[PDB]
Amino acid sequence: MFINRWLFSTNHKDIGTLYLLFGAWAGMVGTALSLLIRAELGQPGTLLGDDQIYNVVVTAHAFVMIFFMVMPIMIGGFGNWLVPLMIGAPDMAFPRMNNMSFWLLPPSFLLLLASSMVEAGAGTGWTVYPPLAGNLAHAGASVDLTIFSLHLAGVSSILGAINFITTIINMKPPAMSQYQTPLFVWSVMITAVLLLLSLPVLAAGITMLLTDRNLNTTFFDPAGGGDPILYQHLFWFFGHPEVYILILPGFGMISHIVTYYSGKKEPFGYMGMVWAMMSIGFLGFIVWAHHMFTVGMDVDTRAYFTSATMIIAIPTGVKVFSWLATLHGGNIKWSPAMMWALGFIFLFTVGGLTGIVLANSSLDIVLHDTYYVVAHFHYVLSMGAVFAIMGGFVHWFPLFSGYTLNDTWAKIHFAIMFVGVNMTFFPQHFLGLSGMPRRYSDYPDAYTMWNTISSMGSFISLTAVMLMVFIIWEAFASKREVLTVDLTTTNLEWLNGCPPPYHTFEEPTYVNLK
Amino acid sequence: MAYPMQLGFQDATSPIMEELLHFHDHTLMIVFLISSLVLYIISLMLTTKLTHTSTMDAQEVETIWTILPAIILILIALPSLRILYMMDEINNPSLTVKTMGHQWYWSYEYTDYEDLSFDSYMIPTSELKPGELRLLEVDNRVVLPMEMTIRMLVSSEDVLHSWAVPSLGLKTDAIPGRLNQTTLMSSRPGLYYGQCSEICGSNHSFMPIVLELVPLKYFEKWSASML
Amino acid sequence: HYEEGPGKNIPFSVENKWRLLAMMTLFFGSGFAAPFFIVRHQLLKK
Amino acid sequence: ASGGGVPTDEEQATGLEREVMLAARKGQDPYNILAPKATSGTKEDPNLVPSITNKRIVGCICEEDNSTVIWFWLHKGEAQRCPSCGTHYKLVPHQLAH
Amino acid sequence: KIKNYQTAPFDSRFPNQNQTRNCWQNYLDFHRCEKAMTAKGGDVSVCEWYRRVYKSLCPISWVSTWDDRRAEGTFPGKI
Amino acid sequence: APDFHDKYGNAVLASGATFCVAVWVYMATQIGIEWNPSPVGRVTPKEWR
Amino acid sequence: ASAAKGDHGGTGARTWRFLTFGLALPSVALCTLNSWLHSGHRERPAFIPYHHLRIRTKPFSWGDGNHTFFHNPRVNPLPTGYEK
Amino acid sequence: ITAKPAKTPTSPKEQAIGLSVTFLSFLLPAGWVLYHLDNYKKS
Amino acid sequence: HETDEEFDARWVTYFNKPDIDAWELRKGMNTLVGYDLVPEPKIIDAALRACRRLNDFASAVRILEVVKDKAGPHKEIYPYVIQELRPTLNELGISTPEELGLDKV
Amino acid sequence: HQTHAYHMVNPSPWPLTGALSALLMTSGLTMWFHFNSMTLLMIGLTTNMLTMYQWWRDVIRESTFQGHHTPAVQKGLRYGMILFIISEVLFFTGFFWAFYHSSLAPTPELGGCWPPTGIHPLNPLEVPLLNTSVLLASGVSITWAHHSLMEGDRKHMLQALFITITLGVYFTLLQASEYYEAPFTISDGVYGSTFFVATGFHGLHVIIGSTFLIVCFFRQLKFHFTSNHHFGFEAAAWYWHFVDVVWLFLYVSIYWWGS
Amino acid sequence: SVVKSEDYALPSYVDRRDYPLPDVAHVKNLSASQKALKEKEKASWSSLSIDEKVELYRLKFKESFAEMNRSTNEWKTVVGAAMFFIGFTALLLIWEKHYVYGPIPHTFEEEWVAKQTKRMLDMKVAPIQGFSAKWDYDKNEWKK
Amino acid sequence: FENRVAEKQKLFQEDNGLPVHLKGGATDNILYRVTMTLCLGGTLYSLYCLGWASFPHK
Amino acid sequence: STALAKPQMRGLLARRLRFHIVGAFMVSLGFATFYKFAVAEKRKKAYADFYRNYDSMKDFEEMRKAGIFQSAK
Ligand SMILES: CCCCCCCCCCCCCCCCCC(=O)OCC(COC(=O)CCCCCCCCCCCCCCCCC)OC(=O)CCCCCCCCCCCCCCCCC
């Protein structure tokens, strides 16, 4: 029973559950790594003694948070659970391939951990640039284990994107057009299209790195006529789309949360929201060299990429505005999920504004590779992606489990986390304006005060993560079973009860053409 | 250099860094305007018992909120790009100097007339003289003439590094097999500090850059004595 | 076919809150402990 | 340049694929491949919603190009109305596979 | 004759940040000049400009490597 | 019929706040943490050469 | 382009088979002729130990570490020149 | 959302215990490694 | 769109339907409180009379609470509405939520 | 009983074994590159073929034998296959980018020219032109095979398909021969790197496409296809045109323009 | 009266400001006295007493508007407990300082700091706004 | 050759409770057990290799 | 006893929004004036005042006497 159900699954809900369990455990690993980064920096001097170990910890923190925590939970977890329930589909198009997307992730994670166990680990930064990543500065197997880790995660996501796109286009009620599907579904479809286009380019680039390292190719090695800068083009060609892939399903969840707890039956400006997501998806393919404003490209190239990058604010502010307009006239229910969402809307805006500042290749000369970049992206990842994840998790938890959380505990959890992240990342703006580099295990003495504060903030977010664990336990410990859910007439995923049964829509929904 | 509890940029030492300060002030004023406006609108949406939960019309209001950000972007881009091109403008330098990154130290080459080159390492903390700056000081500083246009050429002999001096508005990556150019002009004499700005291994945090900017006559005597 | 309903559509048991607490502790606790043990391993290897 | 030997669907299709093919040929849609056509949806002319149990989920697109679909359970019994536009739906249970 | 050199002037052939080829072209120019002169009987000192320019711009380790490859017969550029 | 917050709210508020302030003030001032604040207006410069 | 032929009324099996035997296979026979005619060995070029060629930054994982996978002694020099 | 009362209520006391054991499962192992970091450094 | 007077008339007519059932009564009020307005007394009047036809005293009181709720911080709206409705309240024996003590938490 | 037309798949062990076989293959390649040993690799290649064999066998059982591929299901498979081809295009795009990057701005270490000093390129009018005619002719015979199948002609289908497969094998033999005869190697700087990685990955795709055609061949011998329902053959034809087009781009970019 | 989980497909009762008339009555099973009351509601409502009008209200609805909209003291518990856990965090920082962190570099000694400040003034660090701009080079003191 | 598709349809549609991967009979099981043994043995071996590679072999 | 007058009863949310969006703007505009006076303009003037009678040789000479340089004792 157990093996058939849990190792041989063909069920979109149970596979979504596995992804949630996987990402939450990866979350713990990524968090402990971030605490180690902040411990090394929380006073002057060296704590690890070993600056290769520091770089290994920074690199692993990033891969774990992006590939094993954020993308499994948002796409694999929420996407599997919610997308068929939102369009009335009996499962995913390819329910057995879907299980391989999930099972590719523990072996991929195992390879990343193995790379930090053997030799001196991969202390390269998550961009893994040659020659630092090459077979002389990083001799031995660590960087090769890392590259293979990324191969298996890229294949898992590419097969997942093909599943989601096929499901969303092919398995709706015959009368429902694409313009009648919920915003979260659009957000996942568009994310799947970015994954499908950008992951194979990543795969081509790290393959060429692997051969430079092991087969005497010289794609990236000036001695054979190669060029380390070609690697950066290939990597960022994937890596920009990758940031938009991390945020877009959170945009989809935020729309549902803010609509729901405003008591509204639809988000304001549904076609503007869909337009804005497609526009961001499109523009996110033509801006990547803003990650390269110091490598020595022509001035015109840099002027174009500054300009193209700024355009992205326009569709983005359309969403920000449409969230606010959705709130407008609401009957506001101050639930914990709505608090996460309101925090998303504000902090994500701050983080997006610092991204605009960095979009100027002029000013970026002085901010590149400083802590101002680290501030920008932790605003949009650790207060955008992660707040959307927490909001989605408290909102839909009763659907997934059949039990309710203690809302008071959940609100305390939000308050502590909110204090923690702001105290950790806000002072990093000062550090980067004042010229402190990224990727440093120690700093000149003048930078002490901000670093001290930032490390203290990080322990406050630790307290919050521990509490969240306790909150989930308390809910399964107490077993308050769900009775009634509001607003089901515009939230189809709740209409089968909590939790829904194993097979839902065996008889599909009935929708008239009219 | 940065000083304790600094909030913003190092004082400009070069005209270009000064241009960046004023452009940054203009951009940050916009940023403050937008984020405060967003915060104000949120608190406004959340402080009334009045409700209106039936359908709203989107297409009308959507113009304001597309045209406005668009005018604002143009307001940032014009001056941004003017500065961009200025950093690129035909300059005619008086001196060329090469810097080569290595793991983990910089070497410098002044080969316009003689073959002057030398290595510049961090001073270890246990060897600092009282009043010297932990992690910042080198044994051999980069002596240059003040008030002159200098062409720096940057490259590396091993992995990537990046040569930066915040006060002057400079950062150029050091890529083996490639020669990147930037130009340096200091308005003032003195000592200006920077730090490797592209992760290069174990001692990335420990290969700093110190410029010593002095009158030409002193630069010439220094160069001769360094052969 | 499979069991359905609250506490049934998950691969771990929630029949006993205390065994569940032990299971959760191990599961999250081993995730959070692991990087500390990897750093130790790297210090001790040399 | 001409002979046979390739089976047809008519000869060789099986299981569900066959059931769909034969029902389509009689203009029936027991597997809900087509969108059902609306009636006037009044009290005397309700949309008839076939089902194999005693309730089925209806989604009503109240007005053309709504982006939001109104969802509700239709139970066996008297006609029920869409909570948003009031149009009528009546469940007709049964049969489908004989 | 026409010297008084401070450093290599701006060269509109190499107007961007990447100056790699500015070093390279001047290094080839000089040695192509020096071939033509030393062979066909003439004065190497017409070649001087190129030599000044490449000494200014080219890292010492590049010039030095390329010199050895010329001595060795493995210099890949056309001289 | 008074709830948890009606019976305990005030006591949780007052003593959470009291506790938090005391332990942060102690930590920040009594355990030797080097904050390295600005010398401006505080340090008397001394000859170093 | 429209090519220089005609049929476009019925694109059936018959037409495609005609093209296979009447155009596709004969081109293959002609390129085969052109080939098994320009073939026959080029006098292998002298060895010059250029530093951008015969790269060995790590040994290969087979043989003696120094021979590429389809190493042909007649036309592929080692870093030290042709083999005996 | 509405819910039934808890089928297995978790009292204040039981919450104290579950909170404590949760907090210690995160703090003790990390604390042990960190406490001994210095023995690993020169050793 | 439609003018204020047209909208008001439409809603008066809706509640005046002689054979209005309970479903349509609920549907109308629950739709009406979605707009940015406190309904005109004449709409409320028609809606209270419909409750009398359906023999539903409780919904008539709920309708008064909803009117007060819709006014939000504008304290002067509800006493004006009660004034205008006072004859209908007296005639049908409708007590106000305050008369019933239902305004006190 | 369901009243939708989609397929609920029986719980399957093949996901897990294909995921573990991925672990063993990447681990095994690391053992091979660093700890000189092929054991883990050999084991992973083995479990991987076993997983592909059983997985695609089961899909044939579900469709040819159990009738679960309704038109709704079949539409899904069409989309899946197009999407997968699209991802394979972007994959190859990374290699064409590498080639253009290196060749449009040759660096000083090469001699500052393209082809680099010391490299002697194959003549594009010889065997590379022949390979091109081989693959193009096989795009014609596979279209004949498809039309024969549609018109119900079993013998001509098998004949056309057989020709296509032979042209594919022939390309693979020409190319192995060319690899052996080439005077440059994968270690010959960026020229040999881009040449052998781009054509090598394409050669691997020719072998996967030939294998797919051979699977279609046997299924057709066994009467699995109808004149209307033959998605396995259509997927294989699209994938075979893809391999033909990637070859045309390689031939124009790398053999011709880059010689 | 008693709501069941398995009634998820049936209309249910909600108390919401924006949905004032719910789909079902709060009480559907009537005692003998409650039936006689519903009979009485079919006659003139002036005949009902205040107590009967209330009882009719409470069969149909569970909470009144005043009840459903009441504010609570939950904010105190939330802010209070959040400050508790935030103070608790300071304990972990105390432990960390005491047992994990060694001594900081000798460059933070008071005398080192005083010399380094003089040397930074000698070299005129940030002389336009940031640092030396705050020192009076003539009076040899920090600008007041 | 002959068209034996109908016989396989009958076999594979037999209502015997077997999932599709075991429905062709005793050979399915053997093939399945072999795959699964090589997968699990292989994985244990690769964890062993990892443990070996995690310490220096001076 | 006197009748109450009929108060405004429609568009009360819209009216509240109209009033305060102006306020939202004003703050900003009057704040804009503030960043640009207390910070930006102050900065242009700090730089221009400093460089108006700046003598770089005299500055150099004070640094040289303080013993800061490697090249100039
Ligand atoms: C935790 C330590 C904080 C230390 C504070 C400074 C000490 C003063 C020294 C004593 C003062 C002495 C005077 C000398 C002035 C130096 C001038 C200069 O050279 O400096 C240029 C500077 C100067 O800018 C500043 O002038 C200070 C900015 C402070 C922003 C206000 C938010 C404060 C919020 C709370 C902080 C943490 C918790 C949550 C943060 C919430 C996220 C915003 O550097 C920056 O670029 C930093 C800004 C980063 C970009 C942030 C984008 C939007 C942020 C929030 C929007 C809120 C709008 C609504 C209004 C929002 C109201 C809530």
Ligand code: HEA
């Ligand atoms: C979720 C992840 C995420 C998201 C969504 C973004 C969004 C943006 N990022 Fe960010 N970024 C990262 C994650 C992300 N980023 C990461 C990880 C890095 C570092 C990579 C590494 O080096 O390791 C990085 C680095 C980075 C750089 C490189 C700087 C450098 O290395 O020097 C740049 C520069 O252009 C940039 C810009 C932007 C911009 C312009 C946006 C925009 O899309 C933001 C748009 C949003 C808004 C503008 C706010 C909402 C709008 C309004 C309220 C309307 C009105 C506004 C105006 C008129 C201005 N980012």
Ligand SMILES: CCCCC/C=C/C/C=C/C/C=C\C/C=C\CCCC(=O)O[C@H](COC(=O)CCCCCCCCCCCCCCCCC)COP(=O)(O)OCCN
């Ligand atoms: C007949 C044409 C058919 C080609 C395929 C058959 C040949 C053997 C296997 C290769 C197929 C695998 C992928 C191709 C990648 C590597 C390049 C192979 C192209 C090739 O075969 O190149 C040979 C070099 O081979 C070598 O090193 C080979 C070394 C073999 C090592 C395998 C490489 C391991 C790398 C695996 C990377 C996998 C990651 C893919 C990511 C998947 C996307 C997520 C060329 O021979 P040479 O002697 O240098 O020159 C000829 C001189 N006379």
Ligand SMILES: CCCCCC/C=C\CCCCCCCCCC(=O)O[C@H](COC(=O)CCCCCCCCCCCCCCC)COP(=O)(O)OC[C@@H](O)CO
């Ligand atoms: C030494 C050689 C091995 C090297 C490694 C990989 C090699 C082997 C790959 C060979 C590919 C063979 C795939 C065979 C699939 C057989 C099953 C099949 O074709 O299934 C068909 C459905 O298609 C479907 O699922 C379609 C399934 C299509 C999958 C195609 C995938 C190509 C695989 C690419 C693999 C790696 C890519 C390389 C990147 C490095 C079944 O439907 P029909 O045909 O309509 O039948 C039904 C009718 O009979 C009813 O009347």
Ligand SMILES: CCCCCCCCCCO[C@@H]1OC(CO)[C@@H](O[C@H]2OC(CO)[C@@H](O)[C@H](O)[C@@H]2O)[C@@H](O)[C@H]1O
């Ligand atoms: C980034 C996350 C880290 C957050 C901060 C961690 C907070 C610490 C909680 C404490 O955990 C421990 O406390 C110890 C004592 O203070 C240790 O005992 C050590 O100390 C002793 C005495 O001082 C001896 O009793 C013992 O042998 C022992 O090893 C040690 O084992 C450890 O488990």
Ligand code: CUA
């Ligand atoms: Cu050199 Cu970082």
Ligand SMILES: [Cu+2]
């Ligand atoms: Cu980007």
Ligand SMILES: [Mg+2]
């Ligand atoms: Mg960089």
Ligand code: NA
């Ligand atoms: Na440190």
Ligand SMILES: [Zn+2]
């Ligand atoms: Zn409707």
